[PDB]
């Protein structure tokens, strides 16, 4: 309406910051949506957690069930386990909501890891954006621990076993502080009466607030330090080529948000995750062959499984073996946010960067990243020792030793192969730059020679052979059909053709449009 907008102007008068934000340009590359995936997962997590807080009681006081789930009637449980059973079986929609919540947590973790991979392999962490790299690393650690505290609130057998082992028994063994930290955290010995309410507070208020603040600072830095882009035709270290916010970018972002919510709803309805009733309440005397925390904590479990038992005994003291696991965990947590500074010190490159690198052009860093992913994958597979040995008929001792030896011999092999593979991709690019695109067509040349009929991308000499071009950090076409070569079928719908006049008109319009687009981007 005109009156409302006129009054908003006469009262707050933005009208220039509004225009400035409406004309902000964003690049359109498929890999720049991986952070949006994590953002939308976090929004869904917020909504579903706010729902879940209206039904949960985080107490450890014991009760008898006497509920609807008959196979558990008469069993002594805690109040948290009974609250989770009530959410699952007596609130209309509660099982659906908590399954959506757990699936959203898993998608959150996976999206964060894929986004970290993109940033690392493209080099978007260099000089201007090192602080944003550090902020993202802190966000990753916080998300790990938030999910860990999350799936431990329904105090059932498997989560209680994971709690006991990891938290209690690794904190208790630390060299000097150790038991002091354990007792400050648990209020005493392991099964107390304050752990579940303390974790509930930490999980619904503290860590979510810190994560929200850090996400705000992260997105503000991304908004005000403009986005990076890949090298291309009209792209420069001084501009941003893409689309403006107002009509297109907001539309695409909202559509992607809706699609991600749809996927999460589908898989929270159709797939069962964490059926706590098949378990029981946690009890210190019972155990099962079940193990393996959520997949983002599996590498610590696998490290604890495959580390050798090296202990130290000196004067009335003891250093157990899980201290090694704690040390390696802290060493990873330290080395992750320090990589930009370590790399700039090693390479001696202190310049400003706005253009991205292709992973094939940085072979050493690509091989480092592949080695790290191989190490992570070995540790993650070592966590499912028993499941692997049961389903794929292998011995348990064999799986343990296989993990123990792979952890040391596989990453350098992956490094070597990744290095050679990147150099091979570079040589393929150079061949395509020197000759033309290979078309696949063979001739016979009446004196009996076979030729291949290349297709040049630039000017040719007087002898017909194309003139070689220079590499410019952009991808090169390898298939003839990806260039407009044999396309544009009939212009019907699927079963009945249109008229030939309409077909010809649409063809000419599209050709003119694409030609003017490429001209407008190449000439300026």
């Amino acid at each position: 309406l005109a009156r409302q907008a006129e009054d908003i102007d006469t009262r707050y008068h933005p009208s220039a910051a509004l225009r400035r934000q409406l004309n902000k340009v964003f690049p359109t590359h498929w890999s720049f949506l991986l952070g949006e995936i994590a953002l939308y997962s976090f929004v869904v997590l917020l909504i579903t957690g706010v729902y879940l807080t209206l039904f949960f009681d985080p107490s450890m006081v014991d009760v008898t069930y006497n509920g609807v789930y008959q196979p558990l009637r008469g069993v002594e449980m805690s109040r948290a386990y009974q609250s989770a059973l009530d959410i699952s079986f007596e609130v209309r929609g509660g099982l659906f909501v908590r399954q959506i919540h757990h699936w959203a947590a898993l998608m959150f973790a996976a999206a964060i890891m894929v986004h970290l991979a993109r940033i690392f392999f493209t080099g978007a962490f260099r000089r201007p954006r090192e602080t944003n790299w550090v902020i993202g690393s802190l966000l990753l650690i916080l998300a790990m621990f938030e999910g860990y505290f999350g799936y431990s609130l329904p105090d059932d057998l498997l989560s209680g076993l994971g709690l006991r082992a990891a938290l209690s028994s690794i904190t208790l063994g630390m060299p000097v502080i150790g038991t002091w930290l354990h007792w400050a955290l648990f209020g005493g010995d392991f099964p107390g009466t304050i752990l579940i309410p303390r974790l509930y507070a930490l999980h619904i208020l503290l860590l979510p607030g810190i994560i929200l603040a850090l996400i705000g600072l992260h997105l503000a830095l991304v908004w005000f330090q403009k986005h990076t882009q890949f090298p291309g035709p009209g792209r420069t270290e001084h501009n941003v080529v893409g689309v403006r916010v107002m009509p297109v970018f907001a539309f695409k972002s909202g559509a992607f948000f809706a699609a991600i919510v749809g996927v999460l709803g589908l898989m929270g309805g159709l797939l069962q995750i964490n059926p706590i009733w098949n378990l029981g309440p946690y009890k210190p005397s019972q155990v099962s062959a079940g193990s393996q925390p959520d997949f983002y904590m599996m590498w610590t479990e696998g490290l604890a499984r495959i580390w050798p038992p090296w202990e130290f005994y000196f004067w009335h003291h003891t250093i157990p073996a899980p201290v090694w696991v704690a040390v390696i965990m802290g060493l990873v947590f330290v080395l992750l946010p320090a990589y930009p500074f370590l790399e700039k010190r090693f390479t001696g490159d202190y310049a400003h960067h706005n253009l991205l690198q292709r992973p094939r052009d940085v072979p050493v860093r690509t091989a480092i990243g592949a080695m790290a992913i191989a190490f992570y994958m070995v540790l993650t597979l070592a966590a499912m020792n028993d499941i692997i040995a049961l389903k794929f008929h292998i011995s348990l001792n064999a799986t343990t030793w296989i993990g123990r030896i792979g952890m040391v011999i596989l990453p350098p092999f992956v490094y070597f192969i990744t290095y050679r593979w990147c150099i091979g991709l570079q040589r393929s690019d150079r061949s395509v730059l020197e000759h033309g695109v290979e078309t696949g067509i063979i001739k016979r040349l009446p004196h009996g020679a076979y030729i291949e009929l290349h297709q040049p991308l630039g000017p040719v000499d007087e002898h017909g052979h194309p003139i070689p071009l220079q590499y410019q950090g952009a991808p090169l076409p390898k298939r003839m059909n990806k260039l407009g070569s044999a396309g544009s079928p009939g212009s019907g719908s699927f079963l009945f053709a249109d008229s030939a006049a309409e077909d010809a008109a649409l063809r000419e319009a599209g050709h003119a449009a694409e030609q003017r687009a490429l001209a407008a981007l190449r000439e300026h």
Binding site: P308, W310, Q357, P363, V364, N397, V408, Q426, Y471
Partner: protein, 76 residues
């Protein structure tokens, strides 16, 4: 960059393309040492010790071959 040739790595002026060779040599030696130490406090059984010594010897042989050939001029 510290330096490789564009005849070895075409895109040598677009990104990090060289890691010193002493790093890889001592890394192989340290991996062999770790594999050897990994049989301290041998729990019952010796079939895995054969795999350990096999892989350690293979790594040492690879490192020694590379070092020898680089020293005598058949590499670089």
């Amino acid at each position: 960059h510290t330096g490789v040739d564009v005849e070895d790595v075409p895109s040598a002026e677009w990104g990090w393309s060289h890691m010193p060779i002493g790093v890889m040599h001592i890394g192989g030696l340290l991996s062999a040492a770790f594999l050897l130490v990994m049989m301290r406090g041998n729990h019952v059984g010796h079939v895995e010790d054969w795999f350990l010594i096999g892989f350690a010897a293979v790594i040492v042989a690879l490192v020694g071959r590379n070092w020898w050939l680089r020293r005598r001029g058949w590499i670089r």
